[PDB]
Design a protein around this ligand. Sequence first.
Ligand SMILES: *CC(=O)[C@H](C[C@@H]1CCCNC1=O)NC(=O)[C@H](CC(C)C)NC(=O)c1cc2c(OC)cccc2[nH]1
Ligand SMILES: *CC(=O)[C@H](C[C@@H]1CCCNC1=O)NC(=O)[C@H](CC(C)C)NC(=O)c1cc2c(OC)cccc2[nH]1
Lengths: 303, 306
Amino acid sequence: SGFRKMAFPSGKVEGCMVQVTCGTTTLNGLWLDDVVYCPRHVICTSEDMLNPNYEDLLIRKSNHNFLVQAGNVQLRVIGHSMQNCVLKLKVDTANPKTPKYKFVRIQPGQTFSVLACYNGSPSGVYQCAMRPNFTIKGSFLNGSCGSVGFNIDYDCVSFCYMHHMELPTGVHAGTDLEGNFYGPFVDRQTAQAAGTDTTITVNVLAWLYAAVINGDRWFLNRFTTTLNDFNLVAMKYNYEPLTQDHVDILGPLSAQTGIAVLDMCASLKELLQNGMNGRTILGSALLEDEFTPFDVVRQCSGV
Amino acid sequence: SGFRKMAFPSGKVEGCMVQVTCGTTTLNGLWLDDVVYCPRHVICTSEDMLNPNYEDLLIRKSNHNFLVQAGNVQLRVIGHSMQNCVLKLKVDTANPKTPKYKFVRIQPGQTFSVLACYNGSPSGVYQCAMRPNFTIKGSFLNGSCGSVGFNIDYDCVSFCYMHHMELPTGVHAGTDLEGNFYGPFVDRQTAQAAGTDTTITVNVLAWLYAAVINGDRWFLNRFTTTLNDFNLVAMKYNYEPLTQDHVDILGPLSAQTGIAVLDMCASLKELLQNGMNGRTILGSALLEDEFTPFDVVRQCSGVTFQ
Ligand SMILES: *CC(=O)[C@H](C[C@@H]1CCCNC1=O)NC(=O)[C@H](CC(C)C)NC(=O)c1cc2c(OC)cccc2[nH]1
Ligand SMILES: *CC(=O)[C@H](C[C@@H]1CCCNC1=O)NC(=O)[C@H](CC(C)C)NC(=O)c1cc2c(OC)cccc2[nH]1
């Protein structure tokens, strides 16, 4: 029993982390087979941060202008190319620890583990949720670019995030491993704003299930609602719409607890309208939405 | 910027996790050099679960009765001894992925990373605190026994916890890697209660410093207080007393922020007495106590491990 923000073990991703340096700019890269993936602005000089001409900066660079270090031993670069906002440095050695892996693009509402790195070395690992406005709420300092986010299924590592940026509001933005930003952001030394954020309704309900399973039950009531009427209350409080697929995905948790999804909706509606009035749920005084149904089942189901 | 509950990189430890089976019990073990460490109740049958006599159970076991699996590879057991609540099973192969390591026993209020495992397979990693009542509030299901907690101290993996038990209240209890329990607990199938818990004052202050470094400054005030006067209110709200040693440990963060420890002590007592009046700190509407002062320094200074 118990519930915590839980990352996937980072061992497989640790074995692919390297540093990449060009001039006085150092950041992290991911070494998979004989390719190192890193953000492309490693090739920028400070004199041209406002709108870098990447195409054109990259042709002026040679393989020897790049320093790649895997655990402080240098990896020789024998070719380089750009794909969207990521740089691909082909090196003379295949990473002997490359895991089975996939590059995937995640949907807002999904979670992944972040391995925060500096100078090619890991600092720590934590979980994040991709928000509806395509930002994440992480812990990243200068030098952390090229840190990756990931999930693990059996033996396969699905890389879904590569870190690039911290917005003026203090949240974080990045790309998939093909160089395409999540959200409308660009890799320029410029202040950019995110869309308005919303709460991930299906995740809040998954968390209420985790609470019930763990003994926290004071918010449950004797009522139910329809999907259409609940969504009217959800819109009113800046919550995402709850879909029929969201109802089916919560089926396992509904089956384990015996509480129907639409009954949990009625309890949430009450929580939205009346607040918590000083009570807590699973140790929190606010309604939490960075746990998916998958995250809850992985931890709370022996069943 | 930003501040999150962050576990240590779990790679060094993943490569040490194995499965141990004896009779009907499968649980996790720790494979370092040529020894596999695991909880001793793996030799137990369900009969006489209320107070097993482990000394006798072990003599009727042999090396061939212990099945150790490291992934697909079976490790031949060539010797076995019991040490407090752990079994030390000598195996015929030394783990080529043993890290630089230490066994240490931690104190209440210190934090560590837990690598939750089931049947030898790592499932997840999270951060936990040794509470003042020698429990941890973990996330453990059946089969998790033998999962370990650890810190990386500069370059050395210091194993400090091996999981054994879940109490009726839902919290968890375990041992050091020498087999001695944290708290007043025993490895027996019985309902056991823990002492009342308290809040770890020094860690809450460390978290207030983390908040400042990250821009939250509203709870700062111009009042002042003494440690004796602070402790008098701390006791009213169930906080551990703040000692001078605790004040010394907040020294580095006081320097980085330019806020003296006792002015932060004044800020915390106002918080306890008056609440946050709808406000939040590092996104939280409650006060956190599972970050040590070094946890704050590690994270806000980008400390790495290699
Ligand atoms: C490369 C790297 O590690 C940093 C990571 C940033 C740094 C600030 C602290 N947290 C963090 O995650 N990435 C960058 O510095 C970005 C480089 C771009 C070319 C991708 N820049 C920003 O993240 C950035 C720039 C900027 C700005 O322009 C002057 C105004 C306000 C905010 C802002 N953030
Ligand atoms: C060894 C193992 O894998 C589990 C881990 C426990 C199991 C329950 C779910 N979460 C968790 O952490 N540990 C055990 O089963 C313990 C074995 C002992 C010999 C150490 N026993 C308990 O955890 C336990 C037993 C028990 C009880 O016995 C009748 C009554 C009330 C509470 C209780 N906890």
